[PDB]
């Protein structure tokens, strides 16, 4: 069993006949799929996806017939003190593994120490760590229009400085085509375009030309720096940064930096010292579905969610609307459910060893990691 | 000074070699000036 | 420095390091920085922590001689030792026993980060005008080649070559000498280099830049002639300020404008700045660095480079000649002896506002600083009229 | 188009005044465009992968 | 430990303390967007 | 990178402490001071990025 997670596996609801949509890859690979078994949200469905397929590769190596399940509840298992007898017990899909309600399991979770206390699974099928949903802020940073990063007072002031000073040196050389020399001789001074009208011969008024000149080449530079910073610099800092980041470490209503309600990573926030109160306020506003995390994410509802570092990756793959967090925490990985002593066990581990040994790993990257061109 | 930031912008002796290089180009302009004068002659 | 809280009713009691402080005498929930300080303190200090919320005031004063606050408490001796962040103060000393600073402090007012920045306008200034002078020499030698290849007219033609030199775009009648044209190459690639160079140092001074461009402070007399300006520049803190009375010792015009400087609430005032309701605000200085760290949005930049007036600090003072006195002094000793006080910045002081470079806000419609170039221009107009006459 | 491209076009501007206004059009225009190519240019310098 | 399948075949193994991988390591080497930045749709304009 | 891997303390098959020391891995990473393991070891001065 498992829960539908795009990073883990992409399994749509079944078809009218249960017809599998025929899917090649971008590699043209006729992507395999099985029949899902899951909730009404108790319904059969269409099994498909990357990691699931990895499992398919598992039975492919060590021969065992395939049978699918899904997670009744959302979580994997959670030690929980009930109202009846109040006995805290790991409770969830892994719970059904205690129930053995399926013959095997697979999912996106590392083994907690707690998990270990119950039972164990082999070394990691994959590696990831703890980081949080980072919602990309509006990149924007477009301005200046044409001249707009120049004041109306600036460009104007300069302009009537041109026409005006034109009139100046004009009458200067006049009283002793200056009237005409205004339009052009002033203009292509300003645009420095070189229409080729002409220039007066007054020894000083030419130097006044040089004044209009450095005026220009200056103004050129004004554009130069203008576009320089205009394209240049950036908005302020992206926050994120440390797992200890004070934005998080300082509870407030600014925005909700969080992760999934009843999550597995919640363990990393569950039994803790330093994390205590922040993880408490988190426990307040925590939300259910990681889907819903993409949801409220795009909704600008809360500051942050958190899921698998991998899950993060595949998320950013999905949408560009958000950002990556800083780095991993509590980093382990995920794998296929295994229960206590198992016949399939040690050999199954050996399989996984052959998996990393194989490139079929990277094939899975194609199934997912490479499956995104983002 | 607090100059530890990057003030470094300026060129005087820095770009002198550029400008002075131009100057030597000019004096060279004298030499080949009279030269090509003779050439045309 | 300190954190007030209400215990969760679902809880009804504390968790984590939360320590109780009552309010009358119904219990209240307690936390905060100095809270943590004394927390670690009493650890080896071996004095069983007991504390509550202050009834009235904050620290204390002389009302007649009376302190409305914690000074009023040890005056009343209602506590064994000082809870709350000490204002290191001489009059405070005169009152009774005091501590060594846990966190150093100072005296300052705190600006928002000025949207009015962008600095001296180095525009022409980067030019390295000694070299630019060497370019004037290039004008000379240019003329030298002019008369040279020869053997107003060539004279003003020089000014044409200076047209090339300056943004090219010189309309006038190039001379027909071939070697002359070679010189045109000289000044040509030359002022090409020079051109893109002015570009270089230019948008450099853009990119690499020193923003700063703020007031010095009460250390400056502009702050001492604020009414002398069109708007006043709000500077100060709220009433009964300890350091405020330090200004009562320090600056007269301070006390003068203090009435206008009257302000209500600390973070409230911070919001007032956020609304620009005031120029800037004195407050608990080191704090002001910190709660400066606290930011609604990341905008403001507290006044001062960090060089502050009147160095100070905070500790747990007491009634003169207390029992634990020198001991708890040693508690300060080993206390800083931790080095975890770094982690005291963590659990408290370390801010998310980060620090240091605010550098580039200077993207602008470029008035002012541009109008300086305009000034150099009009000046040229002046010299022009001079020679004209 | 010589104006447009780095100016520096030797050839015989026409004498029309309104034409000269158009010369202003392409003039400040390719000025913008000019320093713009500068912009994105030394950008791709500065910001780069 | 070198996490390894043959290693596994040998005998008992641990869980990774520090994750690892397989790679070679370059020194830092001592596309030319030059025209490319132009936004040639606008340049077409 | 190619071929994800790691390092641990292996042993002869079916050791005595086996699953226990496995748990030692469990609580081990359970520290979080392993960050400080990067400190005392892994954290580099070459910085990154």
Tell me the three-class secondary structure of D6-37, residue by residue.
CCCCCCCCCCCHHHHHHHHHHHHHHHHHHHHH
CA dist list (Å): C3 to C6, C35, C222: 10, 8, 37
**Structure token pair of residue A17:** 């006949």
Q: Distance between CA atoms of A14 and A93, rounded to whole angstroms?
A: 22
Contact by Cβ (8 Å): C153, C245: no
Optimal mutation site among E7, E10, E15, interface F, most CBs of chain F within 10 A:
E15
Report the run of H or E that residue A286 belongs to, with start and end.
none
| R_g over Cα of chain A | 33
Q: Judged by CB atoms within 8 Å, which residues 147-166 of C form the interface with B?
A: 148-149
DSSP assignment of C98-150, as one string? ----SEEEEEEEEEPPPTT---S--SSGGG-HHHHHHHHHHHHHHHHHHHHHH
Place of tokens 């150093």: C104
Q: Distance between CA atoms of C364 and C382, rounded to whole angstroms?
A: 29
Q: Distance between CA atoms of C19 and A227, rounded to whole angstroms?
A: 56
Bridge partners, A130 (sequence order): A308
Task: Tell me if chain A has a CB within 8 Å of the CB of C298.
Answer: yes
Contact by Cβ (8 Å): C306, C104: no
Q: Distance between CA atoms of D23 and D14, rounded to whole angstroms?
A: 10
Q: Distance between CA atoms of A307 and A129, rounded to whole angstroms?
A: 9
C vs D: CB pairs below 8 A: 6
Report the run of H or E that residue A232 belongs to, with start and end.
none
Q: Distance between CA atoms of C233 and A204, rounded to whole angstroms?
A: 47
- List of chain C residues whose C-beta atoms are within 8 Å of the C-beta of residue A204: 384, 387-388
Q: Where are the beta strands (DSSP E) in A94-184?
A: 130-132
Q: Do B9 and C201 count as a contact with CB atoms less than 8 A apart?
A: yes
Optimal mutation site among A182, A225, A231, interface D, most CBs of chain D within 10 A:
A231
Q: Distance between CA atoms of C135 and C138, rounded to whole angstroms?
A: 4
Sign of the Cα torsion A213, A216, A221, A222 reads positive
Place of tokens 């000793």: C333
Assess whether chains E and D touch, using the rule of 3 or more C-beta pairs within 8 angstroms: yes
Task: Tell me if chain D has a CB within 8 Å of the CB of E45.
Answer: no
Q: Which residues of A107-139 are buried (b: 16+ CB within 10 A; e: fewer)?
A: bbbbbbbbbbebbbbbbbbbbbbbbbbbbeeee
Q: Distance between CA atoms of C258 and A210, rounded to whole angstroms?
A: 54
Q: Distance between CA atoms of A154 and C366, rounded to whole angstroms?
A: 7
Q: Nearest CA to C204 among C262, C135, C264, C123?
A: C123
CA dist list (Å): C128 to A214, A215, B10, B18, C133: 15, 18, 6, 14, 9
| R_g over Cα of chain F | 15
Place of tokens 């007031």: C215
**In 10 A of CB A242, how many CB atoms?**
14
- Tell me how far apart the 2 most distant CA atoms of chain F are, in Å: 44
Q: Which among E11, E16, E22 is the nearest to F12, CB-wise?
A: E11
Q: Which among C144, C186, C210 is the nearest to B22, CB-wise?
A: C186
Q: Binding site annotation covers C92?
A: yes
Contacts of A130 (CB under 8 A, 6+ apart): A243, A265, A268, A306, A309, A328, A329, A330, A331
Q: Distance between CA atoms of A207 and A215, rounded to whole angstroms?
A: 12
Q: Distance between CA atoms of A1 and A99, rounded to whole angstroms?
A: 13
Q: Distance between CA atoms of A281 and A287, rounded to whole angstroms?
A: 12
Q: Nearest 5°: phi and psi at C172? A: -95, 110
- List of chain D residues whose C-beta atoms are within 8 Å of the C-beta of residue A228: 39, 42
Task: Tell me if chain F has a CB within 8 Å of the CB of E16.
Answer: yes
Contacts of C63 (CB under 8 A, 6+ apart): none
Assess whether chains C and F touch, using the rule of 3 or more C-beta pairs within 8 angstroms: no
Q: Nearest 5°: phi and psi at C324? A: -75, -5
Q: Nearest 5°: phi and psi at E20? A: -145, -175
Residue of chain B minimizing CA distance to C210: B5
CA dist list (Å): C278 to A96, A171, C211, C270: 64, 51, 22, 9
State the nearest Cα–Cα gap between C354 and chain B, in angstroms: 18
**Structure token pair of residue C105:** 């402090």
Q: Do F3 and A112 count as a contact with CB atoms less than 8 A apart?
A: no
Binding residues of A for glycine: 108, 110, 115, 264, 308
**Structure token pair of residue E45:** 């304009």
Angle at D19 between CA D17 and CA D23, to 5 degrees: 110
Q: Which residues of A48-58 are buried (b: 16+ CB within 10 A; e: fewer)?
A: bbbbbbbbbbb
- List of chain C residues whose C-beta atoms are within 8 Å of the C-beta of residue B22: 138, 186-187, 189-190
Q: In what order do the strands lie in the sheet with C19-20?
A: C3-5, C29-31, C19-20
**Structure token pair of residue A207:** 């130097």
Q: Which among E5, E13, E15 is the nearest to A357, CB-wise?
A: E5
Q: Distance between CA atoms of C207 and B8, rounded to whole angstroms?
A: 12
Q: Which among A112, A329, A356 is the nearest to F4, CB-wise?
A: A356
- Tell me how far apart the 2 most distant CA atoms of chain E are, in Å: 70
Q: Do D8 and C168 count as a contact with CB atoms less than 8 A apart?
A: yes
Count of alpha carbons within 13 angstroms of residue A182, beta-carbon side: 15
Q: Is F2 helix (H, G, I), strand (E, B) or coil?
A: strand
Contact by Cβ (8 Å): A319, A294: yes
Contacts of A142 (CB under 8 A, 6+ apart): none
Q: Distance between CA atoms of A67 and A53, rounded to whole angstroms?
A: 13
Q: Do D43 and E34 count as a contact with CB atoms less than 8 A apart?
A: no
Contact by Cβ (8 Å): C184, C174: yes
Q: Which among A124, A331, A353 is the nearest to E5, CB-wise?
A: A353
Contact by Cβ (8 Å): C103, C349: yes
Bridge partners, E22 (sequence order): F2
Q: What is the resolution of this structure in A?
A: 6.2
Long-range contacts of F40-48 (CB under 8 A, 24+ apart): F42/E18
Contact by Cβ (8 Å): D26, D14: no
Q: Nearest 5°: phi and psi at C364? A: -155, 160
Q: Nearest CA to D6 among D44, D33, D24?
A: D33
Contact by Cβ (8 Å): C4, C30: yes
Q: Do B12 and C131 count as a contact with CB atoms less than 8 A apart?
A: yes
Q: Distance between CA atoms of A208 and C383, rounded to whole angstroms?
A: 9
Q: Nearest CA to A51 among A352, A350, A285?
A: A352
- Tell me how far apart the 2 most distant CA atoms of chain C are, in Å: 107
Q: Distance between CA atoms of D33 and D4, rounded to whole angstroms?
A: 9
**Structure token pair of residue A189:** 């001074």
Q: Nearest CA to D39 among C360, C211, C207?
A: C207
Q: Distance between CA atoms of A69 and A53, rounded to whole angstroms?
A: 14
Report the run of H or E that residue C386 belongs to, with start and end.
helix C369-388
Place of tokens 């590769």: A57
Sign of the Cα torsion A194, A198, A200, A203 reads positive
DSSP A45: E
DSSP F38: I
């Amino acid at each position: 069993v498992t829960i539908h997670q795009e990073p883990f596996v992409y399994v749509k609801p079944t078809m009218s006949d249960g017809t599998c949509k025929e899917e090649f890859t971008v590699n043209g690979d006729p992507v395999k799929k099985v029949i899902c078994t899951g909730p009404n949200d108790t319904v059969p469905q269409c099994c498909y996806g990357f990691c699931i397929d990895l499992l398919i590769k598992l039975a492919r190596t060590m021969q065992f017939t395939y049978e699918v399940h899904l997670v009744a509840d959302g979580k994997f298992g959670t030690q929980e003190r009930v109202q009846n007898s109040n006995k805290k017990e790991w409770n969830g899909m892994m719970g059904e593994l205690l129930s053995g309600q399926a013959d095997m399991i697979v999912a996106p979770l590392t083994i907690n120490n707690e998990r270990a206390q119950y039972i164990e699974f082999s070394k990691p099928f994959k590696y990831q760590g703890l980081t949080i949903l980072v919602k990309k802020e509006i990149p924007r940073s477009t301005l200046d229009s044409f001249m707009q990063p120049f004041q109306s007072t600036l460009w104007l002031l300069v302009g009537l400085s041109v026409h005006v000073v034109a009139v100046m040196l004009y009458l200067l050389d006049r009283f002793s085509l200056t009237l005409s020399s205004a339009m052009w001789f002033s203009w292509g001074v300003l645009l420095n375009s070189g229409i080729g009208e002409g220039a007066p011969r007054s020894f000083s008024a030419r130097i006044l030309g040089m004044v209009w000149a450095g005026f220009a080449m200056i103004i050129v530079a004004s554009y130069t720096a203008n576009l320089a910073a205009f394209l240049v610099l950036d908005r302020p800092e992206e926050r994120i940064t440390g797992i200890n980041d004070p934005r998080l470490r300082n509870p407030s209503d600014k925005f909700i930096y969080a992760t999934v309600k009843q999550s597995s990573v919640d363990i990393y926030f569950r039994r803790q010292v330093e994390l205590s109160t922040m993880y408490r306020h988190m426990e307040k506003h925590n939300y259910e579905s990681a889907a819903e995390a993409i949801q409220a994410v795009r909704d600008n509802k809360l500051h942050a969610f958190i899921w698998d570092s991998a899950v993060l990756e595949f998320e950013a793959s999905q949408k560009c609307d958000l950002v990556t967090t800083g780095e991993l925490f509590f980093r382990s990985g995920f794998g296929i459910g295994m229960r206590k002593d198992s016949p399939w066990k040690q050999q199954v581990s050996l399989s996984i060893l052959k998996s990393h040994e194989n490139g079929f790993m990277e094939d899975l990257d194609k199934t997912w990691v490479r499956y995104q061109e983002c | 000074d607090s100059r530890s930031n990057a003030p470094a912008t300026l060129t005087c002796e820095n770009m002198a070699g550029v400008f002075m290089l131009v100057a030597g180009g000019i004096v060279a302009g004298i030499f080949l000036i009279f030269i090509e004068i003779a050439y045309k002659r | 420095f300190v954190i007030v809280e209400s215990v969760d009713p679902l809880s009804g009691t504390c968790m984590r390091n939360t320590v109780p402080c009552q309010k009358r005498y119904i219990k209240k929930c307690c936390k905060g920085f100095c809270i943590d300080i004394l927390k670690k303190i009493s650890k080896s200090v071996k004095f069983t922590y007991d504390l509550y919320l202050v009834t009235n005031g904050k620290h204390g004063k002389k009302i007649n001689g009376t302190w409305n606050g914690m000074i009023g408490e040890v005056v009343m001796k209602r506590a064994y030792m000082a809870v709350g962040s000490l204002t290191i103060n001489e009059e405070r000393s005169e009152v009774v026993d005091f501590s060594v600073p846990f966190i150093e402090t100072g005296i300052s007012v705190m600006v928002s980060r000025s949207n009015g920045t962008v600095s001296p306008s180095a525009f022409l200034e980067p030019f390295s005008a000694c070299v630019w002078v060497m370019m004037f020499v290039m004008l000379l030698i240019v003329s030298a080649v002019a008369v040279f290849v020869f053997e107003f007219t060539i004279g003003k033609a020089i000014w044409l070559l200076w047209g090339l030199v300056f943004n090219n775009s010189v309309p006038v009648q190039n001379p027909k000498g071939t070697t002359s044209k070679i010189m045109v190459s000289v000044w040509a690639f030359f002022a090409v280099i020079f051109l893109a160079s002015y570009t270089a140092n230019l948008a450099a001074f853009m990119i690499q830049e020193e923003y700063v461009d703020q007031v010095s402070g009460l250390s400056d007399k502009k702050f001492q002639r604020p009414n002398d300006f069109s708007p006043p520049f709000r500077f100060g803190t709220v009433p009964n300020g300890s350091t405020e009375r330090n200004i009562r010792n320090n600056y007269a015009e301070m006390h003068a404008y203090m009435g206008k400087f009257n302000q209500r609430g600390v973070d409230d005032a911070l919001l007032s700045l956020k609304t620009g309701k005031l120029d800037a605000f004195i407050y608990d200085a080191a704090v002001l660095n910190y709660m400066a760290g606290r930011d609604e949005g990341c905008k403001l930049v507290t006044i001062g480079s960090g060089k502050v007036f009147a160095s100070t600090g905070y500790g747990i003072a007491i009634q003169k000649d207390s029992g634990w006195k020198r001991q708890v002094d040693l508690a300060i000793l080993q206390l800083f002896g931790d080095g975890e006080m770094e982690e005291l910045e963590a659990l408290w002081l370390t801010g998310i506002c980060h620090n240091e470079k605010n550098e580039v806000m200077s993207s602008q419609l470029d008035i002012d600083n541009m109008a300086g170039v305009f000034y150099m221009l009009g000046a040229a107009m002046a010299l022009s009229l001079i020679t004209f006459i």
